[PDB]
Design an enzyme around this catalytic site. Structure first.
Site, mmCIF file in Angstrom:
data_model
loop_
_atom_site.group_PDB
_atom_site.id
_atom_site.type_symbol
_atom_site.label_atom_id
_atom_site.label_comp_id
_atom_site.label_asym_id
_atom_site.label_seq_id
_atom_site.Cartn_x
_atom_site.Cartn_y
_atom_site.Cartn_z
ATOM 1 N N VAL A 28 6.547 -0.370 4.427
ATOM 2 C CA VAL A 28 5.804 -1.168 5.403
ATOM 3 C C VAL A 28 4.312 -0.887 5.230
ATOM 4 O O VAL A 28 3.485 -1.798 5.294
ATOM 5 C CB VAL A 28 6.238 -0.851 6.864
ATOM 6 C CG1 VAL A 28 5.288 -1.488 7.880
ATOM 7 C CG2 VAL A 28 7.658 -1.321 7.115
ATOM 8 N N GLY A 29 3.982 0.379 4.999
ATOM 9 C CA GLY A 29 2.599 0.804 4.835
ATOM 10 C C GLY A 29 2.389 2.215 5.342
ATOM 11 O O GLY A 29 3.330 3.008 5.413
ATOM 12 N N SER A 30 1.147 2.528 5.696
ATOM 13 C CA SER A 30 0.804 3.860 6.174
ATOM 14 C C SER A 30 1.010 3.988 7.680
ATOM 15 O O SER A 30 0.771 3.043 8.436
ATOM 16 C CB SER A 30 -0.643 4.202 5.811
ATOM 17 O OG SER A 30 -1.539 3.256 6.371
ATOM 18 N N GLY A 31 1.464 5.164 8.099
ATOM 19 C CA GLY A 31 1.534 5.518 9.512
ATOM 20 C C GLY A 31 0.698 6.759 9.752
ATOM 21 O O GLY A 31 0.004 7.232 8.847
ATOM 22 N N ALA A 32 0.764 7.293 10.969
ATOM 23 C CA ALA A 32 0.058 8.529 11.291
ATOM 24 C C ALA A 32 0.688 9.720 10.562
ATOM 25 O O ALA A 32 1.838 10.088 10.822
ATOM 26 C CB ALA A 32 0.035 8.758 12.797
ATOM 27 N N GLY A 34 1.707 10.072 7.453
ATOM 28 C CA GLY A 34 2.784 9.773 6.509
ATOM 29 C C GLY A 34 2.969 8.293 6.248
ATOM 30 O O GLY A 34 2.382 7.456 6.935
ATOM 31 N N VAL A 36 5.429 4.808 5.876
ATOM 32 C CA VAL A 36 6.504 4.204 6.660
ATOM 33 C C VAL A 36 7.328 3.243 5.806
ATOM 34 O O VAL A 36 6.777 2.449 5.037
ATOM 35 C CB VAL A 36 5.952 3.454 7.911
ATOM 36 C CG1 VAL A 36 7.084 2.841 8.731
ATOM 37 C CG2 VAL A 36 5.102 4.388 8.788
ATOM 38 N N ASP A 162 1.629 5.809 18.202
ATOM 39 C CA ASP A 162 0.605 6.798 17.812
ATOM 40 C C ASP A 162 -0.153 7.512 18.943
ATOM 41 O O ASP A 162 -1.283 7.977 18.749
ATOM 42 C CB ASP A 162 -0.389 6.174 16.816
ATOM 43 C CG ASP A 162 0.249 5.846 15.477
ATOM 44 O OD1 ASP A 162 -0.382 5.101 14.697
ATOM 45 O OD2 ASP A 162 1.368 6.336 15.197
#
Ligand SMILES: Cn1c(=O)c(Oc2ccc(F)cc2F)cc2cnc(NC3CCOCC3)nc21
Length: 343
Positions: A28-32, A34, A36, A162
């Site tokens: 999906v992309g970047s998360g906090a 890490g 995702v 977040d």
């Protein structure tokens, strides 16, 4: 947690090792802290977001924040707040424990990829405030609420991402700063949970107009945009600015009166204007709270005092605790092991 079989796959240029139940993993992309992946949970039939934490125990700061995020997600059980569907590690013991995977609902979009009606604004802001009442009732502050951490499904059902978690990405003409309360943007004082209410005000205004409320080109430009709308601070607020340096700068600015919000938000619901005036107060002591905002006339069609729950007590004594990496790691492992999935 009777040990499931794990399988391995390379996704975001590392190898992901996840229980068999999770299928069709796609980035999906970047998360906090890490990356995702979207996945299908064959056990629940839910589309899920799986976050693999990057280097969770690399340092004391990393180990503590890993524990922090896990503690936060495990606590949050509310329709309008991201919660934990699952947490796992391929590790069979604390000794080989190195990776943490977090699982939540896969959401359709965020509030960015939604806007650029008054009834839709009502519903969206209502749910944000409902979620915030819950988060705040546990003495948790989001601190960085913005459209990109407000996720929404097709039916416009909303969840807050977040919550409770650098200078360069705060620099310039950037969305990362546009929603921040001035007291936190400029480090005026020890701030309270109504920093998040400032953010809601900015978000609401943008939903109503299709435009960024305070699109500052930098910290100072943004402050000027803010002060032009809400007025320069009075003596009372100046006293509360404990940073002598920040207080000294503020007093150098030419005094400006608060603008008329009905002339700023032309054609908007008078009740929306009124709420914005109560949310966008410079003195954080005087800002409307989430609980108070839910009772405002603007949300008459959604407000239900019996359907706006508060959180169980949240012990965050760990925040003022100093521990070694292996200690934070052990606490984290305990929390992974003790996890019970939601019904
Ligand atoms: C960007 N993002 C996260 O960072 C995220 O964090 C997690 C938090 C706790 C966990 F247990 C697991 C996590 F993965 C979850 C998440 C869910 N749905 C979506 N949908 C996108 C929203 C923006 O448009 C494309 C779909 N995005 C997400």
């Amino acid at each position: 947690q009777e040990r499931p079989t794990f399988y391995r796959q390379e996704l975001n240029k590392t190898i992901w090792e996840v229980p068999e139940r999770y299928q069709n993993l796609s980035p999906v992309g970047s998360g906090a802290y890490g990356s995702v992946c979207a996945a299908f949970d064959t056990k629940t039939g839910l589309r899920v977001a799986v976050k693999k934490l990057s280097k969770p125990f690399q340092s004391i700061i990393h180990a503590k924040r890993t524990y922090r995020e896990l503690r936060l997600l495990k606590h949050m059980k509310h329709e309008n707040v991201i919660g934990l569907l699952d947490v796992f590690t391929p590790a069979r013991s604390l000794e080989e424990f190195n990776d943490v995977y977090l699982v939540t609902h896969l959401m359709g979009a965020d509030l960015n990829n939604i806007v650029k009606t008054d009834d839709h604004v009502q519903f969206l802001i209502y749910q944000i405030l409902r979620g915030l009442k819950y988060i705040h009732s546990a003495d948790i502050i989001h601190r960085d609420l913005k459209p990109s951490n407000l996720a929404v499904n097709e039916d416009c059902e909303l969840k807050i991402l977040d919550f409770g978690l650098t200078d360069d990405e705060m620099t310039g003409y950037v969305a990362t700063r546009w929603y921040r309360a001035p007291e936190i943007m400029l480090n005026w004082m020890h701030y309270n949970q109504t920093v998040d209410i400032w953010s809601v005000g900015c978000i609401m205004a943008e939903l109503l107009t299709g435009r960024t409320l305070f699109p500052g080109t930098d910290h100072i430009d943004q402050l000027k945009l803010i002060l032009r709308l809400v007025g320069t601070p009075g003596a009372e607020l100046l006293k509360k600015i404990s940073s002598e340096s920040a207080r000294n700068y503020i007093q150098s600015l030419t005094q400006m009166p608060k603008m008329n919000f009905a002339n700023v938000f032309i054609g908007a619901n008078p009740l929306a204007v009124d709420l914005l005036e109560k949310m966008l107060v410079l003195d954080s002591d005087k800002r409307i709270t989430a609980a108070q905002a839910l009772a405002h006339a603007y949300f008459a069609q959604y407000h239900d005092p019996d359907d706006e729950p508060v959180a169980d007590p949240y012990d965050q004594s760990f925040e003022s605790r100093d521990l070694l990496i292996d200690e934070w790691k052990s606490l984290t492992y305990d929390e992974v092991i003790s996890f019970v999935p939601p019904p």
